[PDB]
Curated annotation (Swiss-Prot):
Full-sequence range covered: 1 to 73 of 128
Protein name: Ubiquitin
Source species: Homo sapiens
Localization of this protein: Cytoplasm; Nucleus
Purpose of the protein: Exists either covalently attached to another protein, or free (unanchored). When covalently bound, it is conjugated to target proteins via an isopeptide bond either as a monomer (monoubiquitin), a polymer linked via different Lys residues of the ubiquitin (polyubiquitin chains) or a linear polymer linked via the initiator Met of the ubiquitin (linear polyubiquitin chains).
Record-listed (Microbial infection) ADP-ribosylthreonine modification sites: 66
Modified sites of kind Phosphoserine: 65
Sites marked Interacts with activating enzyme: 54, 72
Amino acid sequence: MQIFVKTLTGKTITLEVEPSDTIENVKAKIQDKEGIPPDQQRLIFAGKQLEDGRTLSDYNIQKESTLHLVLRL
């Protein structure tokens, strides 16, 4: 798979993921790229703030889907 993540700073990064990857897992990949703590990370999928425990599959996030990164820091 692949998806896209977005930063208010415009900054659009891509990511590699697995269908069953958790949001905590997506956050871990963001922390790698943007070095931003997962607990200061809030992901939104098409206007929905994603829950750390559920997986990309639950939120029906398929390939090429875009999540917007919001920081609760």
